Amino acid sequence: DGVGSSSGNWHCDSQWLGDRVITTSTRTWALPTYNNHLYKQISNSTSGGSSNDNAYFGYSTPWGYFDFNRFHCHFSPRDWQRLINNNWGFRPKRLNFKLFNIQVKEVTDNNGVKTIANNLTSTVQVFTDSDYQLPYVLGSAHEGCLPPFPADVFMIPQYGYLTLNDGSQAVGRSSFYCLEYFPSQMLRTGNNFQFSYEFENVPFHSSYAHSQSLDRLMNPLIDQYLYYLSKTINGNQQTLKFSVAGPSNMAVQGRNYIPGPSYRQQRVSTTVTQAAASEFAWPGASSWALNGRNSLMNPGPAMASHKEGEDRFFPLSGSLIFGKQGTGRDNVDADKVMITNEEEIKTTNPVATESYGQVATNHQSAQAQAQTGWVQNQGILPGMVWQDRDVYLQGPIWAKIPHTDGNFHPSPLMGGFGMKHPPPQILIKNTPVPADPPTAFNKDKLNSFITQYSTGQVSVEIEWELQKENSKRWNPEIQYTSNYYKSNNVEFAVNTEGVYSEPRPIGTRYLTRNL
Amino acid sequence: SPLMGGFGMKHPPPQILIKNTPVPADPPTAFNKDKLNSFITQYSTGQVSVEIEWELQKENSKRWNPEIQYTSNYYKSNNVEFAVNTEGVYSEPRPIGTRYLTRNL
Amino acid sequence: DGVGSSSGNWHCDSQWLGDRVITTSTRTWALPTYNNHLYKQISNSTSGGSSNDNAYFGYSTPWGYFDFNRFHCHFSPRDWQRLINNNWGFRPKRLNFKLFNIQVKEVTDNNGVKTIANNLTSTVQVFTDSDYQLPYVLGSAHEGCLPPFPADVFMIPQYGYLTLNDGSQAVGRSSFYCLEYFPSQMLRTGNNFQFSYEFENVPFHSSYAHSQSLDRLMNPLIDQYLYYLSKTINGNQQTLKFSVAGPSNMAVQGRNYIPGPSYRQQRVSTTVTQAAASEFAWPGASSWALNGRNSLMNPGPAMASHKEGEDRFFPLSGSLIFGKQGTGRDNVDADKVMITNEEEIKTTNPVATESYGQVATNHQSAQAQAQTGWVQNQGILPGMVWQDRDVYLQGPIWAKIPHTDGNFHPSPLMGGFGMKHPPPQILIKNTPVPADPPTAFNKDKLNSFITQYSTGQVSVEIEWELQKENSKRWNPEIQYTSNYYKSNNVEFAVNTEGVYSEPRPIGTRYLTRNL
Amino acid sequence: SPLMGGFGMKHPPPQILIKNTPVPADPPTAFNKDKLNSFITQYSTGQVSVEIEWELQKENSKRWNPEIQYTSNYYKSNNVEFAVNTEGVYSEPRPIGTRYLTRNL
């Protein structure tokens, strides 16, 4: 429109209908100039990397991008509490995104002092990768998302991508992408940008915990009409004896379904005053290999974090680890991080730090005793049932399913909704503004630009579909609740210095339903 | 998906079976109940045509640098690749895959 | 149709309308099996060639082809005489082609004796290269065309083609063509084949000889209003003198147009009892080089064969040479060949064995005498006019203009009509009939086939447009005529052994018109 | 046809000429007939877009063996051809012609 007219209003609210909840969040953003308007080839050689497992090749772009792939970007703690305490499931339906109130500033430094002024004629470029023609980086748990607290002003993360690499070198199959080779809208201070997105059909997330275990689905009062081998020797003559499988021996009863797959993780205890044989963080970790590179199995298949009563143990890399407010980047203590756990899925999923089971490994005879072997990793078998990893308030929402010939249960392993066509990447960049050029023609590209940055507001609205609970359970359910006991600060609030903090990870599985 | 490569189908193209009808030789002038085992030596020849329509998925890549492409080598050789020899023998000098273009993962 | 019904009639006649003549010719052909149904790579190594100039690489196909690219295939000598004596020009308009009365025979050899019988179920395959996707070999003066005498039965020539070569080896750019990769009609004894073709617009061939010379177009009674430098020295003082160019000095008169281009050829005399300095057939020949290979300039640009009264001389390779009936293939005497001449174009074209002219090569002064140099080769200049090479009864009719970015006056240098889309190649082959295969499966291609050949009739009808003469010349014209004087045989007739012969080449340029 | 390569036209795309309008500095308070030679130092910047529609002539070759094609080399290298360097410098490593497909003469 014009310089003196706002291009949008501040929309931040949650609307709770019967089977739907609509979340709207608005944030103020700041966008600097990245790479001084240049594309730069990057690799482990440029960053000084040495290990083969961490070698990479890619490019850093002068473009930023908007990321809102975390639940706290849309749900307040109270809204999250309502959702998890009142619904058996939820899933995103549609998306509305807006950019408005664009403000481009120029920075001039004379001597140790910088002056900031408006540049009303400068432009900011925004486009969406609706055709998914660029590498998708929103499927990784990267920082730079919209802040959970609406009053926080955030910096737009720089967009970068990786391609095929051989050490620090590239190959002929490696791809280079120029983001200026895409049509993009150019916005001055009076312009705004908006688009709508429809989520593809995804299953409802399981925001419930099973009230029954897979091995306890039988009637505890009635025998089965099936027999099991109860005795082999009479007291070395072979005397086979069979007995009815009933309530007194539930472990041997016939069952129609079995627990889901497993990929065993090393067990680590958080208890203080403990000794360790050696440094086993990398050496003792479960991993998978691709083209000679070892990658940590993290978080891996959805498995129960620990057995009943063993909350002190957690899988080495089988759980999401969040950092508390103010936590450092490198080598922080256990009390500075928040270790999530998936104990709710112990009713259907195997324990992460235990073998799946035992399998016969020979043919027993009068000369050879029957032998069994531990199954540390078990693939998918017919009749298996399992629960996917729970999602969290500060955890990811969705991920892009890789474009491959085949996949199985493409639920993101870090939690969330897997989609072939997720919300498109939204890329933003400040248009370069050259400084005064020389009065004589020079064919070289200009490298002198006016120092600029941009700021504005961003709004994203997502409609969520709800799956209401119809339980006939008589006794009250477990519910997420704040603790009344006095404390120096209110949980999920600001401190005396105005710092917002999330004191604990919040799952979604508090209500119960039968298996 | 077939492990040797290709398209797996519950109802693939049906088997097409062909046989020359037996033509008995001169039978004896007195009835014999045994099946005939004397036949005229025969063989058949003809032409066979098969037409298949293939659907294509075009590429919409935004890649800037040129892709890898299958190409013949200009360097001189005694014979042209995928052609006949001086004795009329056709040969396929190398296996050719399908994966030269690129797309993101 | 059926075995016992003819699929076509014998059509061979010429119909003379006012401005059009329609020629129809029918011939009986025989088609054997070529290369034993195989494609074979051929080169100068396979044929034993050694010279770089004659090195080649290509393929020989089991297919034959029909060629009617010679005028005597359509015009009888009497029709040719009428055409050349009564018309100033002619050009082909449309084409009709027919194959019918297909007869496929099988040959069986027991011991030194062959038996031929019909194979009613065998097929012959015919298709036309209407899209010009195959190498065009009809543009070369190859043998194998329809015989001039309708009663002669001819053998179908085998189709072969050449591609890019480096010595006896091929390169990556070389192309291999499989003629079975084309849709073709399969004909049994009851079937027939036919198609129609329309000639693209071409200029009328010049079937006239100019009655004026390019240097004698002025009025012989009136002076020009232009002056020429007549004198330089007064008898070494420079005294310029100028004079009117008039009838007394026609050589110095100003002229608006000049003779056409030239590429000088060595002069060879047919007179007996003559001595030669050395063997100059190849060493003394004019040639052009392409990629290091030298090719004889033959017949080269259309130039006058000899000056007036010098009929004994002919250019070394600037004239078409036809062989008399029964003439051998290698090293025949001059009396066994018929040397064509282009003396009719001496009025506009330069003499083949003479320089185009003289050009100044220095600046004359009081110290240096004026110098001139002979122009042995002269390219196209503005104001040039020329006549193309004449066509002959036994000469070629058309040629395919090479598909190139540029060309100039694409009239075929051997004579005829140049076309981007000439009459398409008509390719024919006997379908292989395998012998008895083994009773056990063998994956190798079959190499045992029934010996077969095919025969039938071929008809081609061409409509020609005529350009009538409207001359006001008073005295009678020169006309082609037979000689009444007694001879043992009639010219253009059969001998006592039934051998048809063409005793002389017949041009088209007997009538006259002004320049 | 232009000898350096390309399409020759009597009426090619017209020349597009651009200039910053001079902005005089403060003139003297007394009239002077001489043309002004004191101007405010200025420069301009903006975006330029050009769209060209090209007509294509498809190939209908009957050639059996594969053609020569322009392709990137898979072998590892420090930089991707036709891409930016570690300093953001774009480079074109080789000239690319147009004549790789083949047709008869």
Tab-separated table of C-alpha atoms in Angstrom, chain A residues 108-421:
chain	number	residue	atom	x	y	z
A	108	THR	CA	26.163	3.581	8.195
A	109	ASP	CA	29.352	3.601	10.277
A	110	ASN	CA	31.431	6.785	10.457
A	111	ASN	CA	33.947	6.094	13.245
A	112	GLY	CA	33.039	3.571	15.943
A	113	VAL	CA	29.410	4.737	15.784
A	114	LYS	CA	26.629	3.288	13.624
A	115	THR	CA	23.561	5.199	12.421
A	116	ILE	CA	20.393	3.349	11.381
A	117	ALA	CA	17.863	4.908	9.008
A	118	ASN	CA	14.978	3.716	6.864
A	119	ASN	CA	15.498	2.861	3.190
A	120	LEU	CA	11.931	3.192	1.921
A	121	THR	CA	12.799	2.191	-1.665
A	122	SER	CA	14.604	-1.071	-0.856
A	123	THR	CA	12.932	-4.443	-1.359
A	124	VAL	CA	12.805	-7.861	0.300
A	125	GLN	CA	12.273	-11.007	-1.777
A	126	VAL	CA	10.113	-13.922	-0.607
A	127	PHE	CA	9.035	-17.123	-2.344
A	128	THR	CA	7.774	-20.573	-1.372
A	129	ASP	CA	9.198	-23.865	-2.660
A	130	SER	CA	5.727	-25.184	-3.452
A	131	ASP	CA	7.138	-27.641	-6.015
A	132	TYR	CA	9.752	-28.968	-3.535
A	133	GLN	CA	12.579	-28.324	-5.999
A	134	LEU	CA	15.110	-27.357	-3.295
A	135	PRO	CA	16.697	-29.486	-0.551
A	136	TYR	CA	14.359	-29.695	2.438
A	137	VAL	CA	16.038	-28.620	5.690
A	138	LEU	CA	12.872	-28.246	7.786
A	139	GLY	CA	12.870	-32.005	8.455
A	140	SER	CA	15.785	-31.665	10.880
A	141	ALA	CA	15.442	-30.381	14.440
A	142	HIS	CA	17.274	-27.130	13.685
A	143	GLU	CA	17.190	-23.971	15.761
A	144	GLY	CA	15.788	-20.729	14.391
A	145	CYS	CA	12.070	-21.467	14.685
A	146	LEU	CA	9.497	-18.957	15.874
A	147	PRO	CA	9.965	-18.366	19.619
A	148	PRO	CA	7.503	-20.018	22.016
A	149	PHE	CA	6.996	-16.663	23.760
A	150	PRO	CA	5.104	-14.217	21.493
A	151	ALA	CA	7.022	-11.179	22.793
A	152	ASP	CA	10.449	-12.536	21.804
A	153	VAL	CA	12.020	-11.116	18.636
A	154	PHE	CA	13.929	-13.750	16.674
A	155	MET	CA	16.614	-13.799	13.994
A	156	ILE	CA	15.848	-15.537	10.698
A	157	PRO	CA	18.200	-18.516	10.213
A	158	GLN	CA	20.403	-18.687	7.135
A	159	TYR	CA	19.467	-21.253	4.492
A	160	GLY	CA	22.033	-23.874	3.548
A	161	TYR	CA	21.989	-27.297	1.954
A	162	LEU	CA	24.215	-30.317	1.391
A	163	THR	CA	24.785	-32.468	-1.685
A	164	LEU	CA	26.736	-35.619	-2.552
A	165	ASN	CA	30.295	-35.612	-1.221
A	166	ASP	CA	33.459	-37.711	-1.397
A	167	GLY	CA	35.469	-36.531	1.577
A	168	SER	CA	35.650	-32.758	1.213
A	169	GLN	CA	35.254	-33.006	-2.582
A	170	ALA	CA	32.163	-33.129	-4.781
A	171	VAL	CA	31.202	-35.538	-7.557
A	172	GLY	CA	29.596	-35.068	-10.952
A	173	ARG	CA	26.204	-36.040	-9.526
A	174	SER	CA	26.361	-33.198	-6.977
A	175	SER	CA	23.798	-30.448	-7.568
A	176	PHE	CA	24.160	-26.680	-7.186
A	177	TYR	CA	20.989	-24.643	-6.654
A	178	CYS	CA	20.637	-20.903	-7.258
A	179	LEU	CA	17.651	-19.505	-5.368
A	180	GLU	CA	17.549	-16.469	-7.681
A	181	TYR	CA	16.543	-18.930	-10.430
A	182	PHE	CA	13.073	-19.004	-8.808
A	183	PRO	CA	10.255	-16.467	-9.250
A	184	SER	CA	9.945	-14.446	-6.052
A	185	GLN	CA	7.785	-11.549	-4.921
A	186	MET	CA	9.637	-8.316	-4.163
A	187	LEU	CA	8.168	-6.325	-1.271
A	188	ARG	CA	8.779	-2.730	-0.271
A	189	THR	CA	7.650	-1.311	3.070
A	190	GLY	CA	4.060	-1.067	1.820
A	191	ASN	CA	3.713	-4.615	0.480
A	192	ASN	CA	2.754	-7.881	2.174
A	193	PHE	CA	3.013	-11.586	1.359
A	194	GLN	CA	0.636	-14.450	2.096
A	195	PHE	CA	-0.190	-17.971	0.949
A	196	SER	CA	-2.341	-20.908	2.021
A	197	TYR	CA	-1.357	-24.563	2.369
A	198	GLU	CA	-3.439	-27.716	2.815
A	199	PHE	CA	-1.940	-30.578	4.808
A	200	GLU	CA	-2.121	-33.951	3.111
A	201	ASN	CA	-4.079	-36.652	4.909
A	202	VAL	CA	-2.103	-38.026	7.862
A	203	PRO	CA	-3.120	-40.327	10.742
A	204	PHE	CA	-4.030	-38.801	14.080
A	205	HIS	CA	-1.135	-38.658	16.519
A	206	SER	CA	-1.560	-41.035	19.457
A	207	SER	CA	-2.043	-38.677	22.408
A	208	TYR	CA	-3.043	-41.586	24.656
A	209	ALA	CA	-1.318	-44.252	26.737
A	210	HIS	CA	-2.575	-47.823	26.554
A	211	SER	CA	-4.319	-49.076	29.690
A	212	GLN	CA	-3.544	-52.690	28.717
A	213	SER	CA	-0.339	-54.529	27.857
A	214	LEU	CA	0.043	-56.692	24.767
A	215	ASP	CA	0.785	-59.772	26.904
A	216	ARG	CA	-2.296	-59.278	29.137
A	217	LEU	CA	-5.187	-59.166	26.657
A	218	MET	CA	-6.721	-62.510	27.668
A	219	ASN	CA	-9.584	-63.235	30.041
A	220	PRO	CA	-7.969	-63.835	33.468
A	221	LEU	CA	-10.760	-66.264	34.446
A	222	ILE	CA	-11.012	-68.717	31.516
A	223	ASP	CA	-8.561	-71.313	30.224
A	224	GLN	CA	-7.546	-71.469	26.584
A	225	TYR	CA	-8.526	-74.426	24.413
A	226	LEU	CA	-4.856	-74.728	23.379
A	227	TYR	CA	-2.070	-76.808	24.918
A	228	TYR	CA	1.617	-76.067	25.459
A	229	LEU	CA	4.619	-78.320	26.029
A	230	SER	CA	5.017	-78.293	29.815
A	231	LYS	CA	7.587	-81.044	30.444
A	232	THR	CA	10.307	-82.793	28.439
A	233	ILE	CA	12.088	-85.157	30.861
A	234	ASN	CA	10.427	-87.444	33.395
A	235	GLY	CA	12.973	-86.654	36.123
A	236	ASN	CA	17.487	-89.107	29.852
A	237	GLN	CA	14.315	-90.661	28.460
A	238	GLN	CA	12.083	-88.203	26.609
A	239	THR	CA	8.552	-87.966	28.051
A	240	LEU	CA	6.516	-85.182	26.447
A	241	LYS	CA	3.842	-83.647	28.684
A	242	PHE	CA	1.257	-81.042	27.694
A	243	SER	CA	-0.909	-78.741	29.795
A	244	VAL	CA	-3.703	-76.232	29.281
A	245	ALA	CA	-2.551	-72.619	29.062
A	246	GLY	CA	-4.624	-70.687	31.580
A	247	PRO	CA	-4.635	-67.788	34.044
A	248	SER	CA	-2.018	-69.446	36.271
A	249	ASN	CA	0.524	-69.421	33.390
A	250	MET	CA	-0.156	-66.399	31.184
A	251	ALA	CA	3.364	-66.302	29.722
A	252	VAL	CA	2.796	-69.478	27.669
A	253	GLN	CA	-0.673	-68.641	26.332
A	254	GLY	CA	-1.111	-68.375	22.586
A	255	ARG	CA	-1.280	-64.802	21.325
A	256	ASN	CA	-2.303	-63.297	17.995
A	257	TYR	CA	-0.038	-60.221	18.028
A	258	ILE	CA	3.528	-59.525	19.125
A	259	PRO	CA	5.481	-56.395	20.108
A	260	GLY	CA	6.986	-54.190	17.451
A	261	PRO	CA	10.537	-54.037	16.120
A	262	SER	CA	13.639	-53.172	18.104
A	263	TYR	CA	17.198	-51.919	17.647
A	264	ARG	CA	18.944	-52.265	20.986
A	265	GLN	CA	20.534	-49.195	22.578
A	266	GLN	CA	23.191	-49.057	25.277
A	267	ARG	CA	21.853	-48.273	28.751
A	268	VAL	CA	23.055	-45.151	30.582
A	269	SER	CA	22.127	-44.233	34.159
A	270	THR	CA	21.629	-40.672	35.406
A	271	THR	CA	22.264	-41.617	39.048
A	272	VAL	CA	25.120	-39.702	40.657
A	273	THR	CA	28.170	-41.474	42.126
A	274	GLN	CA	28.499	-44.087	39.381
A	275	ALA	CA	31.558	-45.578	37.693
A	276	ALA	CA	32.045	-46.320	34.000
A	277	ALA	CA	34.429	-48.850	32.474
A	278	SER	CA	35.550	-46.466	29.713
A	279	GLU	CA	34.371	-43.716	27.368
A	280	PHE	CA	31.538	-45.452	25.505
A	281	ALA	CA	29.528	-42.506	24.139
A	282	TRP	CA	30.651	-43.104	20.550
A	283	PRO	CA	32.227	-46.604	20.848
A	284	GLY	CA	29.207	-48.110	22.619
A	285	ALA	CA	26.538	-46.372	20.540
A	286	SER	CA	24.219	-48.064	18.068
A	287	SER	CA	24.739	-46.824	14.524
A	288	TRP	CA	23.961	-47.459	10.864
A	289	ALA	CA	26.394	-47.196	7.959
A	290	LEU	CA	25.802	-45.536	4.585
A	291	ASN	CA	28.470	-45.495	1.852
A	292	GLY	CA	31.199	-46.078	4.424
A	293	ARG	CA	29.977	-43.336	6.782
A	294	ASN	CA	28.696	-44.253	10.243
A	295	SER	CA	25.703	-42.288	11.529
A	296	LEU	CA	24.376	-42.527	15.072
A	297	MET	CA	21.063	-44.352	15.429
A	298	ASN	CA	19.292	-41.341	16.917
A	299	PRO	CA	16.581	-41.500	18.085
A	300	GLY	CA	16.009	-44.748	16.181
A	301	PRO	CA	12.895	-46.923	16.310
A	302	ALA	CA	10.224	-46.042	18.852
A	303	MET	CA	11.013	-48.195	21.890
A	304	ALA	CA	10.254	-48.032	25.598
A	305	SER	CA	12.933	-45.960	27.314
A	306	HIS	CA	13.142	-48.159	30.419
A	307	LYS	CA	11.431	-50.970	32.282
A	308	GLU	CA	8.978	-50.335	35.108
A	309	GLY	CA	10.640	-48.604	38.048
A	310	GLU	CA	13.897	-47.954	36.145
A	311	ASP	CA	13.374	-44.260	35.345
A	312	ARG	CA	17.046	-43.601	36.166
A	313	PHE	CA	18.072	-45.382	32.941
A	314	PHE	CA	17.793	-43.938	29.438
A	315	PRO	CA	18.953	-45.233	26.044
A	316	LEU	CA	22.276	-43.797	24.911
A	317	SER	CA	20.743	-42.158	21.831
A	318	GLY	CA	17.151	-43.427	21.740
A	319	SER	CA	15.489	-40.402	23.341
A	320	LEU	CA	15.099	-36.739	22.460
A	321	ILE	CA	17.281	-34.485	24.623
A	322	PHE	CA	16.210	-30.866	25.073
A	323	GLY	CA	18.303	-28.140	26.659
A	324	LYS	CA	17.079	-25.992	29.520
A	325	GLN	CA	16.975	-22.219	29.171
A	326	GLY	CA	20.481	-20.771	29.215
A	327	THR	CA	22.166	-24.156	28.730
A	328	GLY	CA	25.513	-24.033	26.959
A	329	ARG	CA	26.340	-25.623	23.633
A	330	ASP	CA	29.189	-28.004	24.515
A	331	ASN	CA	29.702	-30.484	27.366
A	332	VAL	CA	26.941	-29.503	29.772
A	333	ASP	CA	25.965	-31.503	32.839
A	334	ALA	CA	22.915	-33.753	33.039
A	335	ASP	CA	20.994	-31.213	35.139
A	336	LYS	CA	21.304	-28.694	32.272
A	337	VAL	CA	19.338	-30.885	29.822
A	338	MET	CA	15.876	-32.457	29.788
A	339	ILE	CA	15.837	-36.157	28.875
A	340	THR	CA	12.528	-37.254	27.374
A	341	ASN	CA	11.236	-40.780	27.945
A	342	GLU	CA	8.765	-43.048	26.143
A	343	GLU	CA	7.632	-45.226	29.057
A	344	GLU	CA	4.007	-44.935	27.898
A	345	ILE	CA	4.666	-47.268	24.940
A	346	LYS	CA	6.047	-50.091	27.108
A	347	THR	CA	2.699	-51.874	26.652
A	348	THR	CA	3.353	-52.546	22.944
A	349	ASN	CA	6.936	-51.611	22.224
A	350	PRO	CA	10.031	-53.465	23.457
A	351	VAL	CA	12.418	-51.849	25.912
A	352	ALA	CA	15.140	-49.883	24.135
A	353	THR	CA	17.915	-51.239	26.386
A	354	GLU	CA	16.788	-54.890	26.300
A	355	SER	CA	16.828	-57.681	23.744
A	356	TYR	CA	13.636	-58.313	21.790
A	357	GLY	CA	13.602	-61.936	22.934
A	358	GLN	CA	15.222	-65.338	22.537
A	359	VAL	CA	15.303	-67.612	19.488
A	360	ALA	CA	16.364	-71.239	19.161
A	361	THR	CA	19.819	-71.679	17.634
A	362	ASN	CA	20.200	-75.470	17.295
A	363	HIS	CA	18.398	-78.820	17.257
A	364	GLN	CA	18.164	-80.333	20.732
A	365	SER	CA	18.937	-84.035	21.103
A	366	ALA	CA	20.100	-86.607	23.636
A	367	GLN	CA	23.671	-85.364	23.066
A	368	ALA	CA	23.118	-81.605	22.611
A	369	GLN	CA	21.260	-79.374	25.056
A	370	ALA	CA	18.785	-76.897	23.596
A	371	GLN	CA	20.428	-73.544	22.875
A	372	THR	CA	18.936	-70.071	22.500
A	373	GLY	CA	20.331	-66.738	21.386
A	374	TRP	CA	19.449	-63.168	22.251
A	375	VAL	CA	17.774	-61.072	19.552
A	376	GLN	CA	19.375	-57.635	19.815
A	377	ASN	CA	17.738	-56.332	16.617
A	378	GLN	CA	14.415	-57.575	15.238
A	379	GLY	CA	12.859	-56.466	11.969
A	380	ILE	CA	9.194	-56.178	11.092
A	381	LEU	CA	7.216	-59.414	11.371
A	382	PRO	CA	3.564	-60.107	10.520
A	383	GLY	CA	1.301	-59.581	13.508
A	384	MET	CA	3.514	-56.886	15.034
A	385	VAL	CA	1.912	-53.814	16.598
A	386	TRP	CA	3.664	-50.744	17.967
A	387	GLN	CA	3.240	-47.108	18.961
A	388	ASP	CA	5.156	-44.267	17.343
A	389	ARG	CA	7.311	-41.835	19.295
A	390	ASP	CA	5.353	-39.225	21.230
A	391	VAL	CA	5.433	-35.565	20.232
A	392	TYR	CA	6.276	-32.743	22.624
A	393	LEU	CA	5.447	-29.074	23.087
A	394	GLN	CA	9.011	-28.091	22.155
A	395	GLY	CA	9.445	-30.973	19.695
A	396	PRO	CA	9.081	-31.105	15.916
A	397	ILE	CA	5.714	-31.186	14.162
A	398	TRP	CA	6.296	-32.653	10.692
A	399	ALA	CA	8.973	-33.907	8.313
A	400	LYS	CA	9.297	-34.520	4.583
A	401	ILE	CA	9.166	-38.169	3.539
A	402	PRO	CA	12.234	-38.769	1.327
A	403	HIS	CA	11.367	-39.272	-2.337
A	404	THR	CA	12.315	-42.944	-2.665
A	405	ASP	CA	10.931	-46.037	-4.362
A	406	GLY	CA	9.949	-47.657	-1.070
A	407	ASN	CA	9.403	-46.864	2.587
A	408	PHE	CA	7.724	-48.487	5.581
A	409	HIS	CA	5.593	-46.575	8.113
A	410	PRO	CA	7.063	-43.161	7.228
A	411	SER	CA	6.349	-41.591	10.601
A	412	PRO	CA	9.330	-39.335	11.440
A	413	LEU	CA	11.585	-41.090	13.937
A	414	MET	CA	12.012	-37.868	15.937
A	415	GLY	CA	8.220	-37.655	16.252
A	416	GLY	CA	5.496	-35.974	14.238
A	417	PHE	CA	3.642	-36.351	10.936
A	418	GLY	CA	5.361	-37.660	7.812
A	419	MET	CA	4.244	-36.124	4.531
A	420	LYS	CA	5.315	-36.444	0.911
A	421	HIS	CA	4.284	-32.784	0.457
